[PDB]
C-alpha cells in the first residue's frame, strides 16, 4: 500500500533527492484529473455486482465443462466461491484506481494467488477469461459506453483512466498465467 504521491517520494528517496519540478508536474496532472478519477471509480462500484455476474457467467457459457462434475464451478459452494473471488479482484482494482497505484492489489490480492490456485485445483485458464470480461466491462463503464447503462456526465476525455483500469486487470492475468 502506496499511492501515486508516495510512489514519487519512494522514487525520490532512493536517489537522495527532494521532489523535483518535473515530478511535481506529473502530480499536478493527477490533481487536475482528480474529479474524473472519482467518476471512473464511481461507475465501477455502482455496477459492481453486474461486472462480476456477467464475468463469471461469461466464463461458464464459453466453458460449460466448468459446471460438470469435477468442474470447479460445480456445486453451489463452488459457484459461490468463484463469484466471491471475482468480487475480490474488482474491489482491489477499484482500490488501485483510487490510489493511482497498483501496490494494494499486488500486495493484498495478487501475492500468493497463482500458487494457492494450483493447490485448490482452480483453473487459471478459466480465471483469465473472467478477468478479461471484467476489464471489458470496467473500461466501458468508465467510458460511459456500457450497452444497457448510460449515465449523464459532463463530457471530456477519460481514455487515460481507462488505460490504467485495463492495466490493473492485465496485472491480475499476468500473475496467474
Amino acid at each position: 500500500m502506496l499511492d501515486a504521491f508516495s510512489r514519487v517520494v519512494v522514487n525520490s528517496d532512493s536517489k537522495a533527492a527532494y521532489v523535483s519540478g518535473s515530478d511535481l508536474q506529473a502530480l499536478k496532472t493527477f490533481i487536475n484529473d482528480g474529479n474524473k478519477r472519482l467518476d471512473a471509480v464511481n461507475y465501477i462500484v455502482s455496477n459492481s455486482s453486474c461486472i462480476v455476474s456477467d464475468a463469471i457467467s461469461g466464463m461458464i457459457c464459453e466453458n460449460p465443462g466448468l459446471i460438470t462434475p469435477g468442474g470447479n464451478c460445480y456445486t453451489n459452494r463452488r459457484m459461490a466461491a468463484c463469484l466471491r473471488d471475482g468480487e475480490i479482484i474488482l474491489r482491489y482494482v477499484s482500490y488501485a484506481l483510487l490510489a493511482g497505484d497498483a501496490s494494494v492489489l499486488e500486495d493484498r490480492c495478487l501475492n500468493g494467488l497463482k500458487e494457492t490456485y494450483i493447490a485448490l485445483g482452480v483453473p487459471t485458464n478459466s480465471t483469465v477469461r473472467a478477468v478479461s470480461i471484467m476489464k471489458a466491462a470496467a473500461v466501458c463503464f468508465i467510458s460511459n459506453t456500457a450497452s444497457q447503462r448510460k449515465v449523464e456526465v459532463i463530457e471530456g476525455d477519460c481514455s487515460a483512466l481507462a488505460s490504467e483500469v485495463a492495466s490493473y486487470c492485465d496485472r491480475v492475468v499476468a500473475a496467474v498465467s
Partner: protein
C-alpha cells in the same frame, strides 16, 4: 505510508467494503489541499541548502558545548553529519508535503530515532533547536503563501512533538 488515500483504503479493505461516498468525499479533500502543500514543497525543494544551513548553525549557536571533546560536534566529520541530518529531515518534510500525510516522516525519520540518539549520544534538544529556528524563520507572504505556510509550520510542529 499514511496519507488520505491510504487510510480510507485500508479501512474499507478491513471491512471488505467497496469504496463508497465517504471514501470519494475524503480523496477530494486531498485534491482541495494539494495546491497549498505542493507550493511549500516546491519552495523547500528549490532553496533547501540555504534553510538547512541556517537551521544547523542555530543548534550550535544555542549549544556551543557540542564542540567539546567527547561530544557530538567535537570534530568536523561529526559537525558535517549534523547538517546532513537536518537535510535528511527536511527532505522527509518535503516528502510529507507531497504525500499530504506524515507517513514518510513517520517511517523513515521518526521510528527508532529515540533508540539511535540515546545509544550515539545525540541530544534531542539540539535537533529541536534546529526545527524551531527553521519553523520560526517563515515569513508568510515573503517565503511562501499563508496556507502553504500552515503546511510548512505544522509539518515542523509534528517533528518537534515527536522528539519532545
Amino acid at each position: 505510508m499514511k496519507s488520505v488515500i491510504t487510510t480510507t483504503i485500508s479501512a474499507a479493505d478491513a471491512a471488505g467494503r467497496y469504496p463508497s461516498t465517504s471514501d470519494l468525499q475524503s480523496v477530494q479533500g486531498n485534491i482541495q489541499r494539494a495546491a497549498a502543500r505542493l507550493e511549500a514543497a516546491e519552495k523547500l525543494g528549490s532553496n533547501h541548502e540555504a534553510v538547512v544551513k541556517e537551521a544547523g548553525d542555530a543548534c550550535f549557536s544555542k549549544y556551543g558545548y557540542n564542540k567539546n571533546p567527547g561530544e557530538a560536534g567535537e570534530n568536523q566529520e561529526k559537525i558535517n553529519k549534523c547538517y546532513r541530518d537536518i537535510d535528511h529531515y527536511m527532505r522527509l518534510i518535503n516528502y510529507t508535503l507531497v504525500v499530504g500525510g506524515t507517513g514518510p516522516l513517520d517511517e523513515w525519520g521518526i521510528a527508532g530515532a529515540r533508540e539511535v540518539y540515546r545509544t550515539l549520544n545525540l541530544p534531542s534538544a539540539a535537533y529541536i533547536a534546529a526545527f524551531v529556528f527553521t519553523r520560526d524563520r517563515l515569513c508568510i507572504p515573503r517565503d511562501m503563501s499563508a496556507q502553504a505556510g500552515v503546511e510548512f509550520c505544522t509539518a515542523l510542529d509534528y517533528l518537534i512533538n515527536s522528539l519532545s
